[PDB]
Amino acid sequence: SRYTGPSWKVSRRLGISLSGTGKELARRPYKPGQHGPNSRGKVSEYGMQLTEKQKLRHMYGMNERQFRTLFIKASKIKEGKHGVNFMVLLEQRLDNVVYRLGLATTRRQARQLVNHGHITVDGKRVDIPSYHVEVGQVIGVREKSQNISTIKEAVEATVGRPAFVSFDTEKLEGSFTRLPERDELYPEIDEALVVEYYNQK
Amino acid sequence: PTINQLVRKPRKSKVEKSDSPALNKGYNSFKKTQTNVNSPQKRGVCTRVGTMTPKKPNSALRKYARVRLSNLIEVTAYIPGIGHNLQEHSVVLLRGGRVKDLPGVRYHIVRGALDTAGVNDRKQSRSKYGTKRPKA
Amino acid sequence: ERNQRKVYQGRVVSDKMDKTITVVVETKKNHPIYGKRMKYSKKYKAHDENNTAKVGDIVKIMETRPLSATKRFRLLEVVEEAV
Amino acid sequence: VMTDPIADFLTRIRNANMVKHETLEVPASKIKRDIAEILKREGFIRDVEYIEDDKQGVIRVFLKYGKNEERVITNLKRISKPGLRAYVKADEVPKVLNGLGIAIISTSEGVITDKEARAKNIGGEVIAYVW
Amino acid sequence: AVKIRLKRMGSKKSPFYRIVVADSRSPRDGRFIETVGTYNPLKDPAEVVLKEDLVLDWLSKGAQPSDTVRNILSKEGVMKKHHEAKNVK
Amino acid sequence: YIDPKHLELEDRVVAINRVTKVVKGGRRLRFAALVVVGDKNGHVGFGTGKAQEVPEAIRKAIEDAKKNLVEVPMVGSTIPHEVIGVFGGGRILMKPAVEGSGVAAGGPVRAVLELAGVADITSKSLGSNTPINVVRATVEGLKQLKRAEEVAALRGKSVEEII
RNA sequence: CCCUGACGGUAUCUAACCAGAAAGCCACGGCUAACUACGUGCCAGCAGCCGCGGUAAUACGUAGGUGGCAAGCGUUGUCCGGAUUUAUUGGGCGUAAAGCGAGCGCAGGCGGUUUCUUAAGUCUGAUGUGAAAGCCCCCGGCUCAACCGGGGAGGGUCAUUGG
RNA sequence: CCCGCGGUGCAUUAGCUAGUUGGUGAGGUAACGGCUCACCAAGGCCACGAUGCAUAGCCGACCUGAGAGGGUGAUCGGCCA
C-alpha cells in the first residue's frame, strides 16, 4: 500500500506544511473533525514523540516496517550521531532525488514517475522508488521519451534547488555533489525525539 | 548468605502455573493422558445451559454452559455477546479468558466457529462475535 | 614412541588386593556460578609387580591399556615413604 | 579473631578519615607498607614514618585535607576477600572511576598501581579500590 | 574411493558449485574432507578458482575426478602436470 | 553556594496531589505541587509548595524551587563518571553515555536531567518510585560528581597525570 | 570437427488500449494516540488491571467523526524481558516475612609476624586444534531488497612446551 | 577399543555388589580385558551423593537479555539408536 487520501488533513494534524511551503494550513490551521476549532488540554510526552515520528514518516510517504528497518540500518554507522545519519540516509532514496532535482512538483508525482519506468541511473532503467542513490550517479529522464507534458513544465518553475544538488537543464542530468547537513535540511522538526521514540520502541 | 552457604545449598526460584490448565491435555483413547501438547483451543459438547448471578456489586443473569472436552475433563465456560443458539448436545470451541463475575469459570466459547453462531446485529467489532460483513 | 602418555601423583589408600593399589589424586577446581575453589578427588587403580608400596606413600603412576575390568595404570616409582 | 589485616588497615583509614583527624597508627606488615607507599605516591597521604620496637609494628600515617578542610580520599574498598578471591587477567585490569581513582594489584613483579600494570600487560590479585 | 566432485550451493534456479574431495559413500551435500576451488556455470566464460597445489597432491594419492571435474581440471592444465610428474618421474 | 535566581529559566510540573485533612463535619482539600526549574545549561533546582488551587500551588513551588540550585558539572554533554544517589528508599544509578545516544531515564529523573542540559546518559531506579524521593535522590547523586580539575588540585599532581 | 533442455514458448524485451477490474481490521474513561449525538435504565451488556450500567453514560448498543497499522488486522496458547520477585554481577532478619531456648563438639570453611625454597592456584609467550552453513566486519551479483557468493574475525573451563 | 574434563529432578529416595573386586592358568576375539571358564583370596563403590524412582536422543545452533543469564534442540550439517 502507499496512501491516497486527501493528503492535506495530514498536514493539519502534524502542524507542519509537508508540501514545499505551498499552504495547506492557510485557512483553518487546526485539526480535522468536529472538535477542530475547539482545542483541548495538554498533550503527553508520548504524544510529542509520536507526533515527531509521524511528521518524519509522512514527509517521505513510507510505511512503518520500512521506516524502522532504515532506522536500524542507520544505527550501524557510529560516525556522527544517530538521528543525523538517519535523516541523511532518508534523503538518498531515488524519490527525493527526483524531487530535489526538479523533475516533479510533489513527491507523489516523483514516486509515480520512478514507478512507471521513466528514469534511469547511469543509463540503466530502475523502477523501484526505495532505491538507494549513492553520491555521484547521474540520474536521467529516459532519453527515449523525455517529451512529456508535466516533466517539461515542472523543469521550468524551479521553486527550490539546493546547495548539494547539481543539474543541467539540457541533457536533464542531475546528481548529488556530496552529502547534505542538518543546517541544510529541515532544522525545524527533530532528530532526538525520534531517537527516544525507538528506545522503548 | 556467605558464599560458602550458597555453595553448600544453591538458590531455587518459584514455579509458575497457567490459568488455563485444561488446555494442556492428552487423549483418553489407548492408554492415558499426556501433558506436552499445549493447545490454543479445545472443543467439546455442552452438557447443560442456562444462567447465573454475578458477585458483589454487579447484578445480572450471565449466560454460561458446562462442557466436556476431548480429553474428558469438565469445566464451565462463558458464552458472550447478545443472544445465542446453544442447546444440549451441541459441539462448541473454547479459548482462554477468565470472567470476573463468579468463581469456577476460566474460558470463553468462540462465536461462529462450530455449532455456535455469530451474533446478528453487530456492526462495529464483528471480528470478535463472529459476524460476517453485511451489505446493510 | 614419540607420543606420550599421562603420569599422575597421589597417596596410596588401599593395599588389600594382591598386586593392585588404589591411588587418590587430588586437585582443586572452581564453582560454575559462584567463584571460590573447592577440592576434588578421584581414585585410580594401578598395578604392582610385587605388592611393594604401602599407605601414605607418595607415588607416580602412568597410563597403560586395560589390565582388568577396572585397572588402567602401572606403578612408576615411590617418591617419599611414610613413617 | 582477626582474619583480614588488610581490611582492618583500610577500615582504620576510612574511620579516622570520616571523623577528620590527622594521624593514625597500625601494626606493620610487608603488604601494608607497600600500599602505604602507593597511597603516598599518588597524593592521598601526606607522610608515613616507620617505628619498630619488639613486635611487628608500627606504621604511622599522616592524612591530608583540602584548602577548606575537605577530604582528598572519599572512600576505600577491599576487593579480594579471604573466602572469595578475585584474580584478573591482563586485559581485565579495572579502571576505577574513569581514571580519577586508582586500583592496586599484586603481580609477579611487585605490588603496583593499575596504570603500571596495563602498561606492562600483566594481571594478578586485586587488593583495593581507593577513589 | 576418494573422489573430486561438485557440490550444489545456489538458491533455486541460480546454481553454484564448490569443488570438493569426498569419500564416495557420502551424500552430495553432506560430509567431505576438504574444499578445493570453486566453479560457476553461469558467467558465460565460466569462472574457475582453484588452489591446484592440493589437486596435484590428492591426485597422486589415488583420488579420482568426476567427468565435469576432469574437464575443468584440464582447461586449467592440471592433468598435464600430473602426466609429467607420474609417467616421467 | 547560592546560584542566584537571575537567569532564563524553563520550569516544569512533575506531579500534583489531592491531599485532605478531616475536620469536624466534613473534609478539607488542598493541592500539593512538585516543580523543577533550570536553564538547560547546568543549573537545576527543585521545589514544592501547596495552596488551595493548582495555579497558586505551582506558583509557590516555583518560588521555592528557585531558592535552591546546583552546579552539575559535565564534560561535553556527558556526566564525568558514574554515581549512585540514595535518599530514603529511592536508589538511582547514572552512567556516562555515548555521543548522540539520548537520555534513557524514567519520569521524574528525566525532568531533572533535561533541565540541566544533560544530553546523553543512562539511568535506572533500583528503589521506590515516589516522585519526591526520586527527585531528591537524583539531586543527591549529582552532588557527588567530581570535576577533573579539582581532583588534580587536591592531590599534588597535574592533569594528564591522572586521566 | 560433431553431438544432447524436463522446466518451456518459462523468465524477459517491444507495440497498442483503458483510471478503467484491485481496502480492510482494531481502538477512542486512566494507564495509552484518538469525542459528540441518539437508544436503553444495576436491565440488556462490558472488562488486561483499576472498574462501568438505577433518566441527561465520552466505559453498554448504533451513527457521524478521529487515531494506529495496512494485504492484512485482532484473539487465545507458549517462552525471555520489564521482576534486584532466589539478589555471583545484584536483597535481607529490633517492631513489616525472617536469629535454632541454650551449651559441648567429629567432618568441613577461614586464620598472627618473618628468612630460604617449591611451583599446585595465579599471570604470561609460542605451537596444534575448536568442520561446513549460521550471528557479526569488509567486498561483490540478481533493476532494489529479502536472498546468493568470496575473504576475515569470534567462540575452550581445551592440550603441549618455555618463562 | 581405552582414558581426562563437561551438561537433570527427587534424601517425604543411604546403603549397593557374589563374576561381585584382585591373582594363577586355560579357552576365546581383529584386538587388550572376568570377555568366558576352573582354582585361590575377601575384596569393590558410596555424603566430593552410591542405589532406586521419574523425565529426556546429544551437539553446531535458535529466541530473548545491558550483561551474567534463562528457554528451546522444527527446516539445514555431524554423531547415535
Residues of chain F neighbouring A82 (CB-CB closer than 8 A): 100-101
Give CA–CA dist F23/B67, Å, rounded. Answer: 57
Q: Which residue has the cell 450471565?
A: B62
Please state the domain count of chain C.
1
Q: Which of residues 125-144 of F touch strand G (CB under 7 A)?
A: 126
The grid cell for E31 is 560430509
In angstroms, the Cα distances linking F38 to B19, F85, F113 are 50, 20, 10
The residue segments making up the domain with residue D108 are: 74-131
Sort F16 into a burial class: Cβ within 10 Å, 0-12 / 13-18 / 19+.
Answer: middle
Sort C10 into a burial class: Cβ within 10 Å, 0-12 / 13-18 / 19+.
Answer: buried
Instruction: Report the chain F residue with the minimal C-alpha distance to residue A82.
Output: F100
What number of other Cβ atoms are within 10 A of residue D62's Cβ?
Answer: 13
Give CA–CA dist B37/B15, Å, rounded. Answer: 19
| D76 strand-pairing partners | D130
Q: Which candidate, E15, E62, E18, E59, places its Cα nearest to that of E36?
A: E18
Q: What is the largest CA-CA distance in chain D?
A: 43
Contacts (Cβ under 8 Å, ≥6 apart) of D59: D25, D26, D27, D28, D32, D33, D36, D48, D49, D50, D51
Q: What are phi and psi of F64, to 5 degrees?
A: -60, -45
In angstroms, the Cα distances linking D80 to A17, D5, D100, D121 are 63, 12, 21, 20
Produce one character per residue of D28-58: b if its CB has 16 or more CB atoms within 10 Å, e if not: beeebebbbebbbebbbbeeeeeeeeeeebe
**By three-state DSSP, how is residue F47 classified?**
strand
Breaks (C-N over 2.5 A) in chain C follow: none
Q: Name the CA radius of gyration of chain F, rounded.
A: 18
Q: Which candidate, D74, D56, D72, places its Cα nearest to that of D64?
A: D72
Q: Using an 8 Å Cβ cutoff, are C82 and C40 in contact?
A: no
Q: Which candidate, B97, B105, B111, places its Cα nearest to that of B64?
A: B105
CA dihedral A158, A160, A163, A166 (to 10 degrees): -40
The residue segments making up the domain with residue B54 are: 1-136
Query: Starting at the edge strand that comes first in sequence, how are the strands of the sheet with D24-26 ordered?
Result: D24-26, D59-62, D47-50
Q: Which candidate, F63, F76, F61, F80, places its Cα nearest to that of F141?
A: F80
Give CA–CA dist A107/A112, Å, rounded. Answer: 9
Residues of chain F neighbouring A194 (CB-CB closer than 8 A): none
The grid cell for F99 is 555521543
Produce one character per residue of B94-128: b if its CB has 16 or more CB atoms within 10 Å, e if not: bbbbebeeeeebbbbbbbbbeebbbbeebeeebee
Helix axes F107-114, F131-142, angle to 10 degrees: 40
Q: Is F103 on the interface with A (CB under 8 A)?
A: yes
In angstroms, the Cα distances linking F1 to C23, D94, F69, F70, F71 are 75, 35, 9, 8, 9
CA dihedral B27, B32, B35, B37 (to 10 degrees): -30
Contacts (Cβ under 8 Å, ≥6 apart) of B22: B42, B69, B71, B73, B75, B106, B107
Produce one character per residue of B19-28: b if its CB has 16 or more CB atoms within 10 Å, e if not: ebebbebeee
The three state secondary structure string of chain B is CCHHHHHHCCCCCCCCCCCCHHHCCCCCCCCCCCCCCCCCCEEEEEEEEEEECCCCCCCCCEEEEEEEECCCCEEEEECCCCCCCCCCCCEEEEEECCCCCCCCEEEEECCCCCCCCCCCCCCCCCCCCCCCCCCC
Helix axes A94-101, A107-115, angle to 10 degrees: 120
Instruction: Quote the minimal CA–CA distance from F44 to chain A in Å.
Output: 20
Quickly list H helices, C5-79: none
Q: Using an 8 Å Cβ cutoff, are E26 and E41 in contact?
A: no
Q: Is the CB of B26 under 7 A from strand G?
A: no
D64 and D4 share one domain:
yes
Protein residue closest to G93, using CA and C1':
B1
**Geometric angle at alpha carbon B77, from B75 and B80, rounded to 5°:** 175
Sort C49 into a burial class: Cβ within 10 Å, 0-12 / 13-18 / 19+.
Answer: exposed
**By three-state DSSP, how is residue A19 classified?**
coil
Q: For A96-157, give the DSSP string.
A: HHHHHHTS-SSHHHHHHHHHTT--EETTEE---TT-B--SS--EE--TTS---HHHHHHHHS
> What is the experimental resolution, given in Å to one decimal place?
3.2
**By three-state DSSP, how is residue F88 classified?**
coil
Give CA–CA dist C79/C59, Å, rounded. Answer: 6
Q: Using an 8 Å Cβ cutoff, are F96 and F74 in contact?
A: no
The residue segments making up the domain with residue C44 are: 1-83
Please state the domain count of chain D.
2
Instruction: Report the chain B residue with the minimal C-alpha distance to residue C35.
Output: B3
Give CA–CA dist B25/B38, Å, rounded. Answer: 7
Q: Phi-psi bin for D115: left (phi > 0), alpha (psi -120 to 50), beta?
A: alpha
Give CA–CA dist B61/B75, Å, rounded. Answer: 19
What number of other Cβ atoms are within 10 A of residue F150's Cβ?
Answer: 13
* Contact at CB, C35 and D83, closer than 8 angstroms: no
Give CA–CA dist B62/B55, Å, rounded. Answer: 11
Q: Using an 8 Å Cβ cutoff, are B121 and B77 in contact?
A: no
| F16 strand-pairing partners | F33
Residue C36 DSSP one-character state: P
What number of other Cβ atoms are within 10 A of residue E83's Cβ?
Answer: 10
The CATH number for A90-182, chosen from 3.10.290.10, 3.90.245.10, 3.40.50.1820, 3.30.43.10, is 3.10.290.10
Contacts (Cβ under 8 Å, ≥6 apart) of B10: C33
Q: Which candidate, B110, B39, B112, B54, places its Cα nearest to that of B77?
A: B110
The three state secondary structure string of D31-90 is HHHHHHHHHHHHCCCCEEEECCCCCCCCEEEECCECCCCCECCCCEEECCECCECCEECC
Q: Which residue has the cell 442456562?
A: B50
What number of other Cβ atoms are within 10 A of residue E60's Cβ?
Answer: 11
Q: Which candidate, A101, A38, A80, A37, places its Cα nearest to that of A191?
A: A80
D85 and D61 share one domain:
no
Q: Using an 8 Å Cβ cutoff, are B65 and B51 in contact?
A: no
Produce one character per residue of D106-119: b if its CB has 16 or more CB atoms within 10 Å, e if not: bbeeebbbbbebbe
**Geometric angle at alpha carbon B11, from B8 and B12, rounded to 5°:** 130
Q: What are phi and psi of C21, to 5 degrees?
A: -140, 145
Give CA–CA dist F113/F86, Å, rounded. Answer: 16
Please state the domain count of chain B.
1
Quick one: fold of F10-67? Double Stranded RNA Binding Domain (3.30.160)
D45 and D58 share one domain:
yes
**Geometric angle at alpha carbon C39, from C38 and C45, rounded to 5°:** 150
In angstroms, the Cα distances linking A195 to B19, F77, F121 are 38, 17, 14
Query: Which of strand H's nucleotides are less than 7 A from any protein C-beta?
Result: 1-7, 10, 21-24, 32-35, 42-46, 48, 56, 76-79
Q: Which residue has the cell 515516589?
A: F130
Q: Phi-psi bin for A123: left (phi > 0), alpha (psi -120 to 50), beta?
A: left
Give CA–CA dist C60/B64, Å, rounded. Answer: 80
The grid cell for D31 is 603488604
* Contact at CB, F146 and D100, closer than 8 angstroms: yes
Q: Is A77 on the interface with F (CB under 8 A)?
A: no
Instruction: Quote the minimal CA–CA distance from A196 to chain F in Å.
Output: 7
Produce one character per residue of A176-201: b if its CB has 16 or more CB atoms within 10 Å, e if not: beeebeeeebeeebbbbbbbbbbeee
Quickly list H helices, F67-155: 107-114, 131-142, 148-154
3-state SS of chain C: helix, strand, coil percent to 5? 0, 55, 45
**By three-state DSSP, how is residue D101 classified?**
coil
Query: Using what technique was this structure determined?
Result: cryo-EM
Q: Name the CA radius of gyration of chain D, rounded.
A: 15
Residue ranges near strand H (C-beta within 7 Å): B 12, 36; C 6, 14, 16-20, 22, 29, 32, 39-43, 45, 47, 63, 65-72; E 26-27, 29-31
